[PDB]
Amino acid sequence: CPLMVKVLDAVRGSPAINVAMHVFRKAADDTWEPFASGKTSESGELHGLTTEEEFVEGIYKVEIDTKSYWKALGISPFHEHAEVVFTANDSGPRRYTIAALLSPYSYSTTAVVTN
Amino acid sequence: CPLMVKVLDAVRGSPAINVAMHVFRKAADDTWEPFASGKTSESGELHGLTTEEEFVEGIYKVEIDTKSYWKALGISPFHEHAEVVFTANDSGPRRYTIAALLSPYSYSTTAVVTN
Amino acid sequence: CPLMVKVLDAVRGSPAINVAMHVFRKAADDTWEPFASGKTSESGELHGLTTEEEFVEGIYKVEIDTKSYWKALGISPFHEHAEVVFTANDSGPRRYTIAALLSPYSYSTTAVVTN
Amino acid sequence: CPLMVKVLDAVRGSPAINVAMHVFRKAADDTWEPFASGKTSESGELHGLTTEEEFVEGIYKVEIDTKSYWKALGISPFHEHAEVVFTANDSGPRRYTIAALLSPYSYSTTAVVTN
Numbered sequence: 001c002p003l004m005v006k007v008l009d010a011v012r013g014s015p016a017i018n019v020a021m022h023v024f025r026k027a028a029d030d031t032w033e034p035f036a037s038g039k040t041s042e043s044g045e046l047h048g049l050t051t052e053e054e055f056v057e058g059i060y061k062v063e064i065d066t067k068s069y070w071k072a073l074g075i076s077p078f079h080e081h082a083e084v085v086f087t088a089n090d091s092g093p094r095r096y097t098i099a100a101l102l103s104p105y106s107y108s109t110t111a112v113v114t115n
Numbered sequence: 116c117p118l119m120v121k122v123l124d125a126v127r128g129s130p131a132i133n134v135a136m137h138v139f140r141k142a143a144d145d146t147w148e149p150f151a152s153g154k155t156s157e158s159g160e161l162h163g164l165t166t167e168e169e170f171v172e173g174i175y176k177v178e179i180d181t182k183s184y185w186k187a188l189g190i191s192p193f194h195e196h197a198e199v200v201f202t203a204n205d206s207g208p209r210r211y212t213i214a215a216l217l218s219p220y221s222y223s224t225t226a227v228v229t230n
Numbered sequence: 231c232p233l234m235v236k237v238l239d240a241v242r243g244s245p246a247i248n249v250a251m252h253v254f255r256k257a258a259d260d261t262w263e264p265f266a267s268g269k270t271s272e273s274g275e276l277h278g279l280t281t282e283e284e285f286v287e288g289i290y291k292v293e294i295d296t297k298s299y300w301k302a303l304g305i306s307p308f309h310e311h312a313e314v315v316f317t318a319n320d321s322g323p324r325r326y327t328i329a330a331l332l333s334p335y336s337y338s339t340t341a342v343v344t345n
Numbered sequence: 346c347p348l349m350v351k352v353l354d355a356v357r358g359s360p361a362i363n364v365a366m367h368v369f370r371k372a373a374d375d376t377w378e379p380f381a382s383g384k385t386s387e388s389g390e391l392h393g394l395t396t397e398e399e400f401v402e403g404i405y406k407v408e409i410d411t412k413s414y415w416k417a418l419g420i421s422p423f424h425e426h427a428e429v430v431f432t433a434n435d436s437g438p439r440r441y442t443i444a445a446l447l448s449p450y451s452y453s454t455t456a457v458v459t460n
């Protein structure tokens with residue numbers, strides 16, 4: 001599994017469950033093409049987005065729908081979504097774990113890249 | 116000044132100086148119209164992006180060129196840029212400060228919304 | 231002002247106002263000697279903690295009473311306090327700004343060290 | 346396993362391996378008594394610190410030796426250590442995952458608490 005995303009809720013101290021996200025890949029014409037999508041599990045994780053064969057070199061964007069998450073909890077947040085844009089597999093295949101920590105007016109994101 | 120951006124460097128413990136960013140406003144056709152841009156000062160701040168009259172409600176995107184910043188320091192970064200996407204809403208006199216804390220493989224962003 | 235503290239609230243998107251904190255200096259017997267204290271202002275800042283003459287090299291601890299802050303807002307917090315422990319070192323004229331971003335189950339802290 | 350700690354390196358985008366930490370519990374005389382200690386594995390995780398029976402109600406402090414970690418990588422960091430102080434099991438047994446994200450001049454910590 002070369003691309004996993006983990007989302008945490010900093011207000012409740014819990015995984016962020018049922019968080020939708022869409023992954024896009026930059027096409028040769030500079031447009032964002034849809035690549036994969038899903039929602040986080042009870043553990044706040046989203047696995048199985050892609051495979052090593054499909055996950056070629058490129059610029060990828062993960063758009064995490066944080067706004068819908070907060071609204072469902074009764075909170076009007078600042079951000080429309082959290083966005084994570086990165087070049088992947090530029091030096092050969094890697095495994096990427098994208099983590100996001102969510103608050104109503106703030107978010108942090110980090111990446112762990114393993115060979 | 117209805118919109119200010121402050122950028123900090125978590126590796127050097129300093130303001131992030133000379134960081135370029137562009138601000139976009141979402142158009143009716145769902146495309147990003149360039150709105151304002153600049154580079155952070157020696158204090159890591161960028162002021163004078165817009166005026167109260169021009170800064171109407173809508174969806175705005177601040178795209179911070181973090182990749183060029185880390186490249187200038189000789190440090191290999193993860194992200195292509197840091198993106199802050201938010202809805203501006205008229206609820207009394209509001210001033211927006213977008214703060215961003217930068218590390219090579221991570222970034223955090225917060226909004227301070229005051230009167 | 232060789233030492234300033236700025237505290238932000240990631241739930242409300244605002245400075246964290248009226249947050250009490252104590253600063254300690256580590257003594258030879260490895261105990262924490264009270265050094266300075268105060269409460270953050272309406273801008274979430276606390277100035278005037280020490281002077282250049284008094285702020286000698288050593289190990290310092292800033293203990294931020296985040297628990298009382300969240301209790302005042304009716305929000306159940308995780309941490310008893312936020313602690314920032316650091317060595318102050320004389321390498322040219324240096325001013326320290328300790329920034330802290332608060333959520334109920336998370337906090338981040340950064341140091342901005344300038345001349 | 347009721348207490349686990351996970352540490353990430355935001356400069357390298359990797360687990361923070363071989364990070365020492367000590368856990369203390371506040372005694373009835375208001376002193377910090379040693380409770381458990383260990384170092385993070387190749388995955389940046391520390392498991393097996395305690396058991397449900399031993400991990401009684403109390404105020405606990407996790408002191409993560411971040412300074413030694415950065416110095417071994419050739420970096421002189423700001424903080425002496427990262428400190429996480431919290432009341433545990435106040436409403437009955439819980440499982441606590443403490444996460445820390447490390448940069449030379451900044452750290453963030455969060456907690457996931459599960460029943």
Ligand SMILES: Cc1nc(Nc2ncc(C(=O)Nc3c(C)cccc3Cl)s2)cc(N2CCN(CCO)CC2)n1
Nearest residue numbers: 214215216223224225238327329330331338339340342
């Ligand atoms: C050193 C400094 N820091 C400022 N503000 C902030 N510092 C840090 C911020 C912040 O949130 N950090 C952060 C953290 C800690 C964790 C995760 C993510 C993040 Cl992003 S916000 C403002 C400031 N000023 C000087 C005085 N000017 C007078 C104008 O009248 C005002 C502006 N100087």
Ligand SMILES: Cc1nc(Nc2ncc(C(=O)Nc3c(C)cccc3Cl)s2)cc(N2CCN(CCO)CC2)n1
Nearest residue numbers: 008097099100101108109110112444445446453454455
């Ligand atoms: C690299 C990695 N990180 C994991 N957990 C966390 N990553 C980051 C965490 C976190 O909170 N970051 C953070 C952020 C984002 C901001 C501020 C502050 C912080 Cl601290 S917590 C889990 C994990 N797994 C690999 C796949 N395994 C099998 C599938 O279940 C087990 C899970 N891999």
